[PDB]
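Subject: mismatched residue count in predicted assembly?

I count 314 residues in my input, but I want to confirm that the predicted structure covers every chain. Input:
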Amino acid sequence: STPGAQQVLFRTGIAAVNSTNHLRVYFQDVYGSIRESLYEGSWANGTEKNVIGNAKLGSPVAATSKELKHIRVYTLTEGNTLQEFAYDSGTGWYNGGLGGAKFQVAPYSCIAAVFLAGTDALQLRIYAQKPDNTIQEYMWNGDGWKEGTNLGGALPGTGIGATSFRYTDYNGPSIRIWFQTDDLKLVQRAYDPHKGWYPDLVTIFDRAPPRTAIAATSFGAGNSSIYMRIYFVNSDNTIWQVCWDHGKGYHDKGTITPVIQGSEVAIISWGSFANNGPDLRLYFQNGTYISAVSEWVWNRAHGSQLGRSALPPA
Ligand SMILES: CC(=O)N[C@H]1[C@@H](O[C@H]2[C@@H](O)[C@@H](CO)O[C@@H](O)[C@@H]2O[C@@H]2O[C@@H](C)[C@@H](O)[C@@H](O)[C@@H]2O)O[C@H](CO)[C@H](O)[C@@H]1O
Ligand SMILES: CC(=O)N[C@H]1[C@@H](O[C@H]2[C@@H](O)[C@@H](CO)O[C@@H](O)[C@@H]2O[C@@H]2O[C@@H](C)[C@@H](O)[C@@H](O)[C@@H]2O)O[C@H](CO)[C@H](O)[C@@H]1O
Ligand SMILES: CC(=O)N[C@H]1[C@@H](O[C@H]2[C@@H](O)[C@@H](CO)O[C@@H](O)[C@@H]2O[C@@H]2O[C@@H](C)[C@@H](O)[C@@H](O)[C@@H]2O)O[C@H](CO)[C@H](O)[C@@H]1O
Ligand SMILES: CC(=O)N[C@H]1[C@@H](O[C@H]2[C@@H](O)[C@@H](CO)O[C@H](O)[C@@H]2O[C@@H]2O[C@@H](C)[C@@H](O)[C@@H](O)[C@@H]2O)O[C@H](CO)[C@H](O)[C@@H]1O
Ligand SMILES: CC(=O)N[C@H]1[C@@H](O[C@H]2[C@@H](O)[C@@H](CO)O[C@H](O)[C@@H]2O[C@@H]2O[C@@H](C)[C@@H](O)[C@@H](O)[C@@H]2O)O[C@H](CO)[C@H](O)[C@@H]1O
Ligand SMILES: C[C@@H]1O[C@@H](O)[C@@H](O)[C@H](O)[C@@H]1O
Ligand SMILES: [Cl-]
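Triage response: the counts match. Full output below for your records.
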């Protein structure tokens, strides 16, 4: 290992945000602090100096952005309330208003977060699990944090993945979330502006490890068209990918890369098939320097490859 890698919590929550190939990755250190590593032509940071706040040890870590102008990082307090670390260009980092609402969630809750797509407005949707094991949506629409739609029961401790996109023929954003139910299946719920939340769950994987990590992205929105990718840790101790492609639906799935038992997972993307992409980056723990965070890359030029073997501070 390295003194650097040893600072990274084993099975840390992982999140990532980007503006094309300008990357930020969030993780928890062994003292409970949330740190940011960065890629701006090369990897940097992830040190004691790149602390953006503190969270309960073992906390989920979620993040969403509007390019790198506005970044929001979500975690649990020691009291099992949702909290938020915020960055705005020109202001830097501060404690977001989410914590002030004191939303109490199950101590084992995960978190997902999206900015709503296709608007300049800063509108956020956060997904977590309440003590009754239901998935609750929380909303910011410019005038305080409020509860949104309750999305029903899920396996206690389920991973939660989420993405927002805007079809170019729609007048408003869509949302898709993924989670695990008590029967251990992985499922999708869906929100469109005309149907609201679709009544029924769509199964994307028949049986997954209990509380397996779940991470999702979408890209290349067009007229009533989208591409989506969902990742989770399967029982073979690897990340698997599930593929939605326009015109084919949920038509394929397969292993991507080995991880440590119980690794968490983050995904970012940019670009589209129509324009010499997309690009995909996955972050996870695969045992490099024991506890370092590693990267997997997909692009058009070279397809599937391992990227940075050990992210800063390793
Ligand atoms: C090794 C090398 O010199 N090039 C290969 C590498 O590409 C990286 C470079 O092309 C670099 C040029 O300045 O641009 C990088 O963006 C790219 O790296 C990858 O993407 C960035 C955004 C981060 O995720 C990096 O950790 C990641 O490695 O890798 C590519 C594709 O995987 C090609 O092999 C290049 O030949
Ligand atoms: C690549 C690099 O060396 N970045 C360092 C630099 O980053 C900051 C500058 O780019 C600055 C220009 O006005 O804007 C800052 O907000 C930016 O901060 C970095 O990017 C944003 C989006 C956040 O992710 C920040 O946490 C991150 O630091 O200078 C800073 C210190 O000011 C850091 O050393 C970066 O390493
Ligand atoms: C300038 C200022 O006083 N900011 C404090 C205020 O933050 C809100 C304002 O910053 C407002 C005007 O620019 O923008 C809001 O977006 C912002 O709230 C933050 O961003 C939104 C998208 C949500 O993520 C919020 O939870 C988050 O705070 O009030 C906050 C508390 O809400 C802080 O005190 C800011 O310093
Ligand atoms: C897959 C398909 O073509 N039809 C399903 C699907 O409905 C589609 C359909 O309404 C089209 C209209 O062009 O818009 C979407 O593709 C929609 O699917 C919804 O969004 C996609 C991105 C996925 O997340 C999908 O799971 C979701 O349902 O779903 C409906 C459910 O009412 C029916 O199952 C159609 O037969
Ligand atoms: C839509 C479809 O049939 N997908 C196949 C396909 O996927 C490839 C393929 O569409 C080529 C076309 O030359 O473009 C990419 O390689 C695409 O890859 C898929 O999307 C990228 C973003 C990644 O998520 C990657 O993991 C994924 O496979 O061929 C592959 C095998 O090479 C599969 O058979 C898909 O189901
Ligand atoms: C985008 C939509 O915004 C509000 O209407 C919420 O009540 C819905 O759950 C959804 O998040
Ligand atoms: Cl110093």
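The pocket of ligand 1 is lined by residues 21, 23, 39, 281, 295, 297, 299, 302, 305, 307-308 (CB under 6 Å). Marking this ticket as 'not a bug'.
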